[PDB]
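Usage example:
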Amino acid sequence: SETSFNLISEKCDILSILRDHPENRIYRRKIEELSKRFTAIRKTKGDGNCFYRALGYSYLESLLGKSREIFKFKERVLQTPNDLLAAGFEEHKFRNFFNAFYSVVELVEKDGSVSSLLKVFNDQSASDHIVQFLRLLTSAFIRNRADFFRHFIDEEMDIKDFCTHEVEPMATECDHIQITALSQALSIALQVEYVDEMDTALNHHVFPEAATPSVYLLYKTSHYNILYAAD
Amino acid sequence: DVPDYAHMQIFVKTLTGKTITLEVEPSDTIENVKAKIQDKEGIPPDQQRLIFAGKQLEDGRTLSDYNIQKESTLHLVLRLRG
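Running the assembly step on the lines above writes:
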């Protein structure tokens, strides 16, 4: 079983990504600015699942060695089947995905390492199963609160159709709704750094607002990579 | 000089549950509204998507174009597709 980094990459110093923008002064500037607050980066595969894979890996990675936080998160993960049922998902259809996620949580709990966590998230089948579970849990969160979220859907699209076509299927890109829904579904405090090609100041968004994030993501060229904050 | 009584307030709701109140004119464009949201919330206009009764609001149009009246409520989501 050869070591792979095709889905979640090895961690490099942050200024490594200057190499991705050799001739854009704006990107270079923004990346230099990022380096004041962030020391390193991990890339995720550009397959449409980047947000879900990134959030899952980085949040689990942030749990390593934290027995108390791990236990409290495990208790929450145990209640998620009830969430899925309430939204009309069927146990026999969500079983393998919930199983994959609970298994990786247990791996972290039983004194896991970064190295073993990476092995799971770089295993195509187990990694995709974790993503699919996160997708379903996101869909369930929205469906169970359809009266709130329906106001935020455009082209006069039904909530249920939205979840069916733009949350549940693998490789469908996330957006604000999905992001804040998953964050809330699992209580994962997340910060997104927004980096575009406009000659502007940097900005970020925190979910939920004014929480101390456990996960930092870099949003750039419609893609999500993982950032590591300085001490 | 005759008074203009068209100035009104509209509301903008966000995914955090917060309601923003805006000072607008029926002839304001959606960009103008987005600019006003930026002044209040610090969200760049380019990152804003505005929705009224399930219909996305296009930049060059006006509030009156969408029959948005006094005390109407709009919905705001960020553009974070990745």
